């Protein structure tokens, strides 16, 4: 039930900030985005040891662009997902963890 | 018709060399790759330069990874195309 996922990211308004990685499953791609926030949160000095989903949302809003292309086993093609869908999936994953 | 196309490129074996751009149509994305080959050919000799079809292909094999994701209006999804498909289309556009 794992589907190849391409994660597209543009970190800054600059076009040369467009980078990408691919993952074995959508869950892996969502986990990678959470790890990115945790790395970013680590750099903050003097902060609470707990973080809320709202902060994860704020980190994703800092990205100029974030989207996913998820392989659909039925069609053989990739379904595109944008930031709002990604936020919801991250919320569901965190609430279940 | 015009179909949203994402061009994925990895220039070196390093994973952090993975970059991408998107275009309004497959033709634009294919044209960009040809622009890239011509730019690369310029710096090698710094002279007027002619190239063979094999050299055109070789530039695409020199990239660690190149692929395209082409939006299909009928399916509403993106078709993945890999290097072999791109090489064929780049040649046809060149011809």
């Amino acid at each position: 039930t794992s589907s190849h996922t391409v994660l597209l990211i543009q970190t800054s308004p600059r076009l040369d900030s467009r980078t990408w990685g691919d993952y074995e499953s959508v869950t892996d791609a969502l986990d990678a985005l959470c790890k990115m926030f945790e790395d970013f949160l680590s750099k903050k000095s003097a902060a609470p040891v707990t973080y809320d989903v709202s902060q994860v949302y704020e980190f994703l809003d800092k990205l100029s662009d974030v989207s996913m292309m998820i392989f659909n086993r039925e069609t053989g093609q990739y379904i595109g997902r944008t930031r709002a869908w990604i936020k919801q999936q991250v919320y569901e994953m965190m609430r279940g963890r | 018709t015009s179909s949203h196309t994402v061009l994925l490129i990895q220039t070196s074996p390093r994973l952090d060399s993975r970059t991408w751009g998107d275009y309004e149509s497959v033709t634009d994305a294919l044209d960009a790759l040809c622009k890239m080959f011509e730019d690369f050919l310029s710096k090698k000799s710094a002279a007027p330069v002619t190239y063979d079809v094999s050299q055109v292909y070789e530039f695409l094999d020199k990239l660690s990874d190149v692929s395209m994701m082409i939006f299909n209006r009928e399916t509403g999804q993106y078709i993945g195309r890999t290097r072999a498909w791109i090489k064929q289309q780049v040649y046809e556009m060149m011809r």
Binding site: - | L7, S12, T19, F37, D39, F40, K43, L63
Partner: peptide
């Protein structure tokens, strides 16, 4: 690899 990257970045990220 740097020469290839320069050519790719010039066209891909042109504005």
């Amino acid at each position: 690899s740097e020469d290839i990257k320069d050519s790719v970045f010039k066209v891909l990220h042109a504005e």
